[PDB]
Amino acid sequence: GGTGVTLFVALYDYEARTEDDLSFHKGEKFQILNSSEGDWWEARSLTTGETGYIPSNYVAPV
Amino acid sequence: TLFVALYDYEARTEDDLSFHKGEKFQILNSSEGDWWEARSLTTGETGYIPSNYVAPV
């Protein structure tokens, strides 16, 4: 079960809670790389180029 | 300006809409935070939807 879109925007600021998390600011754009774990998604920041986990209810489709 | 549901959602509160993946909506108010007021184009019903569950057509 996945998302039909792949380009997302942060609705809120987020501070990484673990080394493999991204930190990000509201407005930051992402490409989603793996949504299959549900609550946590792997994403690429389109600002930093970095890959890591984001909380899936912090982002919405652009 | 149509939006489409990416996922099914089962709402358990009075004012929130339930909907199915693919259901189409007109957005009525996105100004009040991340729950938007919308009209379902299936039922004609208005209520709130979580804005991360829909995308522009």
Binding site: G1, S35, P55, N57 | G33, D34, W35
Partner: peptide, 7 residues
């Protein structure tokens, strides 16, 4: 206060 998608 948004739900997590059911992915």
């Amino acid at each position: 206060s948004l739900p997590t998608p059911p992915t």
